[PDB]
Amino acid sequence: ELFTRKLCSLDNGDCDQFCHEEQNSVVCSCARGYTLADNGKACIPTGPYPCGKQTL
Amino acid sequence: IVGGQECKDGECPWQALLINEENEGFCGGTILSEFYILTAAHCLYQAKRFKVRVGDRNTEQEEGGEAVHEVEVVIKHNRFTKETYDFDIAVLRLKTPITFRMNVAPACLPERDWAESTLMTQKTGIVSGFGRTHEKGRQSTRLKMLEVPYVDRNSCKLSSSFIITQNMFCAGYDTKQEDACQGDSGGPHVTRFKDTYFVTGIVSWGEGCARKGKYGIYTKVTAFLKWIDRSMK
Ligand SMILES: O=C(CN1CCC[C@H](NS(=O)(=O)c2ccc3cc(Cl)ccc3c2)C1=O)N1C[C@@H]2C[C@H](C1)c1cccc(=O)n1C2
Numbered sequence A: 001e002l003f004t005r006k007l008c009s010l011d012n013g014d015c016d017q018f019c020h021e022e023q024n025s026v027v028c029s030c031a032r033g034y035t036l037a038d039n040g041k042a043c044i045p046t047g048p049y050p051c052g053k054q055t056l
Numbered sequence B: 001i002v003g004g005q006e007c008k009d010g011e012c013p014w015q016a017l018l019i020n021e022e023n024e025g026f027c028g029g030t031i032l033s034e035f036y037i038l039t040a041a042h043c044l045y046q047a048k049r050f051k052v053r054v055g056d057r058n059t060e061q062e063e064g065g066e067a068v069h070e071v072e073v074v075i076k077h078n079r080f081t082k083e084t085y086d087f088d089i090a091v092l093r094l095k096t097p098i099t100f101r102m103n104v105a106p107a108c109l110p111e112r113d114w115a116e117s118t119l120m121t122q123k124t125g126i127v128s129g130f131g132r133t134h135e136k137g138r139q140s141t142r143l144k145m146l147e148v149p150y151v152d153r154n155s156c157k158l159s160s161s162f163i164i165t166q167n168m169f170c171a172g173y174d175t176k177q178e179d180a181c182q183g184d185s186g187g188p189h190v191t192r193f194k195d196t197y198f199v200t201g202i203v204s205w206g207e208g209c210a211r212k213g214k215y216g217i218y219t220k221v222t223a224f225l226k227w228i229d230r231s232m233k
């Protein structure tokens, strides 16, 4: 018997990066160097060379 | 790296290379920040005094965005064990800050729980370095990268003559002749998630290179996330 995928288990809870469930809802956070967007899902780089991006 | 592809311009910006007194590459590292490299503990035993090269893609030419940094502090994990390579991890603090540019940038550190459920459950990660292209060959002069499948711990342990501890994981191919190799030690295992690359492992050891029924063994970075953060304070 396999659980139905919901919350953070469903497409990373629609977060760009870190997803945790708190108070029974999805909460998104970002690595250092990013700030959470107004939609509270996307992470925006705050400077020129943010971590984990290829320099293309 | 045995197999895999050459690292193209800007594709592995977080690669670092440890160089000896003779300016030779002997181990890999990962860029964590302006001041900090991640590598393998056992790499420290390989050279008397060493330095850190970044932005390097071709040992024979001058990359241009290439730079050498000196080590101020070496923080070896106090539990590292020569007999098992458990806790094979160290952090380097540089004397001067790294300049981020084309081919020089840090990898992201994930959070532990999210890393375990999301990153570590992807099909594959990428490993890279300037190590041998064959088990008995010379160091590479070109940076290479190789997509390596995650291996389940069962298959991993069964295939292993030695103890795979909780601080390690397996990645690679049962038969396909691609793997990390001597000289890739200390280098990046990163996992892509939604166009962002996170540090997941440190090149540790293997029984040979790309041998049939064997795998590459990596330090599980998720197990040291807290420590790594302590280190940078
Ligand atoms: O096997 C090893 C270390 N080791 C020995 C020689 C072959 C190989 N060198 S390699 O081919 O250059 C090499 C090095 C790193 C690699 C990383 C990846 Cl991802 C894949 C393949 C790799 C191959 C290697 O890693 N250990 C397992 C146990 C406990 C520790 C660590 C230990 C220490 C000393 C001796 C010994 O026998 N053992 C046995």
Ligand SMILES: [Ca+2]
Pocket: B056, B057, B058, B059, B060, B061, B062, B063, B066
């Ligand atoms: Ca070069």
Ligand code: NA
Pocket: B172, B173, B174, B175, B176, B179, B210, B211, B212, B213, B214, B215
């Ligand atoms: Na193999």
